Design a protein around this ligand. Structure first.
Ligand SMILES: N[C@@H](CCC(=O)N[C@@H](CS)C(=O)NCC(=O)O)C(=O)O
Ligand SMILES: N[C@@H](CCC(=O)N[C@@H](CS)C(=O)NCC(=O)O)C(=O)O
Ligand SMILES: [Zn+2]
Ligand SMILES: [Zn+2]
Lengths: 217, 217
């Protein structure tokens, strides 16, 4: 019995954790809740023993966790990706926070029925947001240090979702386009994404007006 | 030139940082932006050399940070409050993310015109969330370990903001009320709350329909 990752059968908040685990090659099992599996989650949520029940959850025998960033960080920490001194640990936590915000900017408007109109000031403001990430990355291959960390898988998934929302926005920054292909070329990431384990869709929860439904529109 | 904390002159995301800095008694300068000090922020932002510009920011010498949780954790890390093992560190990250959600539940709805109608489902769901937190605190004085951490100040603030929105919701859980009085009695915190540094209002941005404007309604 490997460590279990529990989440909706969507990319959402779990995709970076899935990408990280496949990158480092660790053993894990997913317990995936499909669109009609709400009751089953209601049962686990009551019975699993989670101290702060939520999705996603992570459970390895008696040890359990909720909160996407806590679970990412637990795996990142087992691999020495959360930095070495108070200054570095803090820098890494900043970058995390910004990447949380970058993904959630999509999430915040994607469930709204007025998505198509919220999209317009979203795209007016996005170039300055992408510019800041594009300048922060500069000509480094990765966000922090010289090898892939959890930060890169957060950043990847946010850039891939935004590129699907509006490709021209992301194409204005050559280094963010090259980052995207660099991650998809990491051999473990490429093998994952070619496997039947990979959830390509939906981006958000099924009920979203952008990146929802069972299949791309 | 002690450490600068920069933020709008609101409680919002920085209040727990102020309460923590106060609690450990470390020296710090606040640069506050008032409701029409927005142009000022843009100019400062221009010069602060922030890698990922935002508010709140924290700056000490040539070390700068954004993201509220990363600032909180840097201060907490310098005081041994982020945990001393991988399981522990992770657990603390999970509680933080929970507390981020707890406070953001109010912000999500507070800016909308339709706040008063969003409020109805919110308070339908609120007792089982408060119940989750009440059981997790259980008999302890503090959320994690036996002395106060950044966690407690995040929790205190979120509880106070919810107390305001609906006093009857929080009064149902005696251990949570006691928690609030405990935090309030802490000598450095009492002194802080009696000083004219202390920001009691607004809870959120001035433009919010709840916990906004110039004064309690
Ligand atoms: N801040 C949390 C958000 C988790 C959350 O909101 N989960 C949603 C799906 S994205 C959910 O279905 N939670 C379980 C529930 O509502 O019972 C995190 O990062 O894990
Ligand atoms: N997740 C971020 C959110 C920061 C944020 O949105 N800050 C707002 C105020 S609460 C802001 O005014 N940012 C300044 C700017 O965008 O220039 C954090 O926790 O610090
Ligand atoms: Zn590993
Ligand atoms: Zn100190």
């Amino acid at each position: 019995m490997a460590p279990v990752l529990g989440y909706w059968k969507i990319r959402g908040l779990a995709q970076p954790i899935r990408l990280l685990l496949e990158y480092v090659g660790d053993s894990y099992e997913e317990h995936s809740y499909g669109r009609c599996d709400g009751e089953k989650w209601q049962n686990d949520k009551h019975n699993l023993g989670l101290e702060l029940p939520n999705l996603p959850y992570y459970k390895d025998g008696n040890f359990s966790l909720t909160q996407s960033l806590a679970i990412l960080r637990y795996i990142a920490d087992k691999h020495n990706m959360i930095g070495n001194t108070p200054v570095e640990r803090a820098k890494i936590s900043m970058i995390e926070g910004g990447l949380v915000d970058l993904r959630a900017g999509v999430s915040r408007i994607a469930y709204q029925e007025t998505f198509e109109q919220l999209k317009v000031p979203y795209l007016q403001q996005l170039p300055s947001t992408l510019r800041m990430w594009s300048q922060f990355l500069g000509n480094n291959s990765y966000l922090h240090g010289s090898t892939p960390t959890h930060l890169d898988f957060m950043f990847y998934e946010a850039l891939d979702v935004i590129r699907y929302l509006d490709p021209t926005s992301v194409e204005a920054f050559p280094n963010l386009m090259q980052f995207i292909h660099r991650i998809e070329a990491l051999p473990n990431i490429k093998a994952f994404m070619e496997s039947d384990r990979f959830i390509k869709w939906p981006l958000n929860g099924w009920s979203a007006y952008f990146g929802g439904g069972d299949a791309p529109p």
